[PDB]
């Protein structure tokens, strides 16, 4: 992102639940249950003459909504947010769009969706 | 040898966006790559059908996506918006509708209907 | 042992100003305390900005409004996303060719 | 609207059908 | 291979001509869709022989009815 993107305030989910990526407020950073779990399992007297371990540029607290900034990217355009303008673009035909190259078609999703959104929530 | 030669498929490996082409330039102790990417800007919403269970009989796109403004139905492709009329030449077959519940009802165009007359 | 010492210095730049900021790393001590350490020479806020200079433990600082150094919890992004529908998306209609630039190092000098 | 177009005829499978199917 | 209606064959456009054993369809390798095979999913380029092992079928004539 060339523009500091974003994260939704409305949980209009109704068949999905976009709330494990888009964070719960339970933790002080923007790192909820899923991001409480991919960091917290990544498991001095040394420094008596100078030898530390350097920290890189982006430590733990820009990317827990910069990855929302890409979550405000890669579903909000699909790809095209990145080098220019972007506004809203939805998902459950993006749950068919990139599937319009996989060999299979658009309304493999749309119709048995109220099973398949549950199965894609079984993919949650 | 994968951005300048050839047209790759690898995003964040040939610049930023869908890689189109590549212009290399020399540099003091360096190599500089220009990149051309197809990154569109302006969009909308659109509204779909599930399908067209036309003769009691469903319909699939070939390579793209059915949409509508809300009344007129349009077949189009994935990345650029050229709405077209849903023909039989944009559909194939594979077997019965309503073991897949959740379709809507519509028509498909079929260009023979003026031809013999 | 007592003098558990690591001492750090912050400046926005010679060409901009000369007021500085001093970071002490390892003391439970304007003064502002971080897990990175005990910081003196800036002001904490509640605001949100990109990082300019890393401090440690999720702290960065910059030079804002007269004007001075302010350090802060470093921002992460703004707010909205997809208005999801179970049956919608659009195309992106109008497009823009653009050019970015990437740099790679070829070779250093063959010194014997 | 497009540059460099040439002007030619396109064959049709359907034009030899109406003379066959009468 | 083909539906052979009018002395000329109806070809794999980008489907391919499938069956349960009695009645006939034309599928892809990916998902599931009923239709009626008509004149405008079918197309010709000559007779019914040159590829190996063809089958037989007619093509419907949907402008024959609506003149009566």
């Amino acid at each position: 992102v060339k523009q500091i993107y974003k994260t939704p305030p409305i949980k209009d989910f109704g068949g999905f639940n976009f709330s494990q990526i888009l964070p719960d407020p339970s933790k002080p950073s923007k790192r909820s249950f899923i991001e409480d779990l991919l960091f917290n399992k990544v498991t001095c007297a040394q420094k008596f003459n100078g030898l530390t371990v350097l920290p890189p540029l982006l430590t733990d607290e820009m990317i827990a909504q910069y990855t929302s900034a890409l979550l405000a990217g890669t579903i909000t355009s699909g790809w095209t947010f990145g080098a220019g303008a972007a506004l809203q673009i939805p998902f459950a035909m993006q749950m068919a769009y990139r599937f319009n190259g996989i060999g299979v078609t658009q309304n493999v999703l749309y119709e048995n969706q109220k099973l398949i959104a549950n199965q894609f929530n079984s993919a949650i | 040898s994968e951005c300048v030669l050839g047209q790759s498929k690898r995003v964040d490996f040939c610049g930023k966006g869908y890689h189109l082409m590549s212009f290399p330039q020399s540099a003091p102790h360096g190599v500089v790559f220009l990149h051309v990417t197809y990154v569109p800007a302006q969009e909308k919403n659109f509204t779909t059908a599930p399908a067209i269970c036309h003769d009691g009989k469903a319909h699939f796109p070939r390579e793209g996506v059915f949409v509508s403004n809300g009344t007129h139905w349009f077949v189009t492709q994935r990345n650029f918006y050229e709405p077209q009329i849903i023909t039989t030449d944009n559909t194939f077959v594979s077997g019965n509708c309503d073991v897949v519940i959740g379709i809507v009802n519509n028509t498909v165009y079929d260009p023979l209907q003026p031809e013999l007359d | 042992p007592c003098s558990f010492g690591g001492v750090s210095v912050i400046t926005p730049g010679t060409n901009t100003s000369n007021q500085v900021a001093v970071l002490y790393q390892d003391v439970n001590c304007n003064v502002f305390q971080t897990r990175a350490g005990c910081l003196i020479g800036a002001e904490h806020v509640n605001n949100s900005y990109e990082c300019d200079i890393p401090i440690g433990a999720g702290i960065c600082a910059s030079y804002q409004t007269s004007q001075s150094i302010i350090a802060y919890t470093m921002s992460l992004g703004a707010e909205n996303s997809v208005a999801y529908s179970n049956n919608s998306i659009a195309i992106p209609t109008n497009f823009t060719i653009s050019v970015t630039t990437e740099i790679l190092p070829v070779s250093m000098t063959k010194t014997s | 609207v497009v540059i460099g177009i040439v002007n030619n005829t396109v064959y049709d499978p359907l034009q030899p059908e109406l003379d066959s199917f009468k």
Side-chain angles (χ1 to χ4, degrees), chain A, chain B, chain C, chain D:
Chain A
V1 289
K2 297 289 185 182
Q3 294 84 20
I4 304 305
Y5 280 161
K6 285 179 182 289
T7 181
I10 305 298
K11 311 300 182 293
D12 191 6
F13 291 161
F16 281 142
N17 195 358
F18 299 164
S19 65
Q20 285 302 318
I21 43 173
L22 306 163
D24 286 334
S26 66
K27 300 295 186 290
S29 62
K30 306 289 185 180
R31 297 182 284 173
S32 71
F33 164 72
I34 299 293
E35 288 182 359
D36 287 325
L37 187 63
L38 296 149
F39 175 79
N40 299 322
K41 291 193 266 79
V42 185
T43 300
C44 299
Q46 301 291 107
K47 285 185 272 289
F48 286 166
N49 284 120
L51 291 171
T52 183
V53 172
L54 293 190
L57 202 284
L58 299 185
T59 53
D60 303 335
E61 282 87 14
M62 294 189 78
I63 315 163
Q65 282 190 357
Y66 273 154
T67 53
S68 84
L70 310 181
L71 278 164
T74 68
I75 33 174
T76 63
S77 303
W79 58 106
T80 91
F81 62 98
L87 279 78
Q88 64 180 1
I89 222 168
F91 170 71
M93 307 181 201
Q94 183 178 2
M95 194 71 201
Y97 266 5
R98 309 177 194 180
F99 312 22
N100 301 324
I102 70 171
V104 211
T105 55
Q106 188 190 353
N107 31 24
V108 179
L109 185 79
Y110 296 135
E111 308 189 359
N112 298 329
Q113 189 180 11
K114 274 77 176 178
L115 176 67
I116 290 173
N118 281 109
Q119 278 185 352
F120 200 66
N121 283 316
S122 177
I124 310 297
Chain B
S1 295
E2 291 190 1
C3 303
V4 174
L5 294 173
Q7 179 175 355
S8 174
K9 289 182 175 69
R10 293 180 62 182
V11 183
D12 284 333
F13 190 75
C14 286
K16 190 66 67 180
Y18 290 183
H19 170 265
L20 292 169
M21 67 190 299
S22 303
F23 290 157
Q25 295 288 105
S26 77
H29 292 169
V31 59
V32 178
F33 293 97
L34 301 177
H35 289 96
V36 177
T37 52
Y38 183 72
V39 181
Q42 186 174 0
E43 68 272 16
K44 288 182 180 180
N45 303 121
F46 277 100
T47 57
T48 185
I52 304 172
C53 195
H54 187 194
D55 305 332
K57 275 164 177 180
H59 281 275
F60 283 175
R62 303 293 181 83
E63 53 187 357
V65 42
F66 308 122
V67 285
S68 69
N69 54 3
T71 298
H72 295 92
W73 287 101
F74 291 108
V75 52
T76 188
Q77 61 179 353
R78 289 174 55 184
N79 307 324
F80 185 81
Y81 178 61
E82 288 183 353
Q84 295 180 0
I85 301 170
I86 293 95
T87 69
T88 58
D89 290 328
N90 310 116
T91 59
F92 47 88
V93 328
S94 176
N96 62 6
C97 275
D98 296 334
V99 75
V100 179
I101 303 292
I103 201 156
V104 298
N105 307 114
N106 191 1
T107 186
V108 183
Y109 183 78
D110 189 81
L112 190 78
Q113 309 306 106
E115 299 182 359
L116 291 171
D117 297 332
Chain C
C2 64
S3 296
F4 195 79
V7 171
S8 300
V9 55
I10 303 98
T11 170
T14 304
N15 201 4
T16 298
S17 171
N18 288 317
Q19 56 178 351
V20 298
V22 173
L23 176 62
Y24 291 159
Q25 290 168 352
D26 292 323
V27 172
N28 193 358
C29 294
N30 289 319
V31 178
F32 186 74
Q33 188 70 45
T34 64
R35 285 188 294 273
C38 189
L39 182 61
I40 292 168
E43 177 65 27
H44 177 75
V45 296
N46 298 119
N47 298 115
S48 296
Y49 294 96
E50 297 181 0
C51 181
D52 194 1
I53 299 171
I55 313 298
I59 297 297
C60 284
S62 176
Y63 179 73
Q64 294 298 111
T65 300
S66 295
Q67 293 182 354
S68 293
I69 303 166
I70 48 172
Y72 57 98
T73 295
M74 47 204 279
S75 73
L76 298 89
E79 54 178 358
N80 72 14
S81 178
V82 172
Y84 174 75
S85 292
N86 60 3
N87 46 5
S88 183
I89 202 187
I91 314 280
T93 60
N94 196 355
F95 56 90
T96 298
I97 304 299
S98 69
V99 176
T100 181
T101 300
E102 188 176 2
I103 305 300
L104 291 174
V106 170
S107 70
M108 62 181 175
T109 59
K110 293 174 283 186
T111 63
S112 174
Chain D
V1 70
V2 173
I3 67 167
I5 308 174
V6 301
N7 205 359
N8 194 357
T9 67
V10 179
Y11 184 78
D12 187 5
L14 271 302
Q15 295 298 319
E17 302 300 315
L18 195 147
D19 290 329
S20 65
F21 185 80
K22 289 183 177 179

